[PDB]
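Summary for the steering committee. The consortium agreed at its last meeting that each partner would contribute one worked example illustrating the joint modelling workflow. Our contribution is presented below. We chose a case with several input lines so that the handling of multiple components could be demonstrated. No manual editing was applied between input and output; the record is shown as generated.
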Amino acid sequence: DLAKLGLKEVMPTKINLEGLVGDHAFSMEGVGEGNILEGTQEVKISVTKGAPLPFAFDIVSVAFNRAYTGYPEEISDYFLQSFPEGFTYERNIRYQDGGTAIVKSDISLEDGKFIVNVDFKAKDLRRMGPVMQQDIVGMQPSYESMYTNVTSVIGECIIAFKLQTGKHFTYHMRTVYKSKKPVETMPLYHFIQHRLVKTNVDTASGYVVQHETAIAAHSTIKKIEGSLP
Amino acid sequence: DLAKLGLKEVMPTKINLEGLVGDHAFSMEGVGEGNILEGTQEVKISVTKGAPLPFAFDIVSVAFNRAYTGYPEEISDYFLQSFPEGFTYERNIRYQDGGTAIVKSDISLEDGKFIVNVDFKAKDLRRMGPVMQQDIVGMQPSYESMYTNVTSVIGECIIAFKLQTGKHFTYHMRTVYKSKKPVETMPLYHFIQHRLVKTNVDTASGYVVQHETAIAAHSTIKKIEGSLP
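What follows is the complete predicted structure of the assembly.
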């Protein structure tokens, strides 16, 4: 199964991010590993150029691979089917205060390692908002709706940053994932539950270790017999 | 418990909707009942004025009461706490094609019956889109993030209409729910899983019976020990 696609159960990954938030350009690197059957991943991230960042780090957490998703056999796995070649995605983010972000990423398979190249561009961020004031402690778990659009897969989600005061600051994320080569079966409508946490925050070392768990599933509410749709 | 709030397990409900979509004004009525502990409801809806509607009915499904939500004891129930007085909500909807909708509703408790008065106003709907062309078969299940904002509760969700061709058409919904009187405890961040189905579609009678199941819960992914937030 995974050997036909050129993958193993525990894949290492290297991710290179080029970012531009407002007028601040920066570059970030991330090295890590994950399990593609259980849908877990853990990456250590550092800032190579542009330090220190004048915004909250957590806005680029979703930029640092849906191959790390736990898919049941009853739901077709688009991302694992996309390999050995990999897949790309274009992702639009609207924050609740009007700010926007655009994330374009390519995920390749090279020497049994997931090589991710991602470009992150944010604009119209409020100077007095929690992102620029860095009042975000982390992300809350989320549910991303996934459905088929001809040959692509669309995922829509509402991400919520928890704030120091206990309040929340949300954004709407819409991603178009495209396999680089044709895929046998396109998936039906389902959800991917995410939980992205920060397992280590070392400000003296300039490293942030984040762990994401992603589990694909249908709704746990049974559809009423003879009902539409 | 429920008797202190003036409620019973199975509450009947009457809902009156005044709507304006584009230049088309209309009025709709709905009579039904639900269980507030299990989080189920079923209402029969008809069009009193403005028939026939030139748009898909399913856009007003979310307008036809979070009191019908199954809440575990470990998650505080804002909506049931809001009673006997009831609660209001203001709801903003952005469709994926640029159209918008505004829903203002009041939910009162009168004679052991949920009396809902809702105003629905939609604009900028595409003439060649699935809403005006009526290509929608129904809603898919969803997950609505719920969190506290001082004294109000904010819920954010992505609703997906299934289309006749099998494709999907989504919209982003953000609702501010406000209890009419103070509430003892405000809830923590959680989700409400919805499944709104159509149990009966009788076009000859002009009636549509819809059933919603709503279950409140935390994330089913265990938070990693010692991680942030």
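Chain A touches chain B through 45 residues (CB under 8 Å). Residues 10-217 of chain A form a domain with the Green Fluorescent Protein fold (CATH 2.40.155.10).
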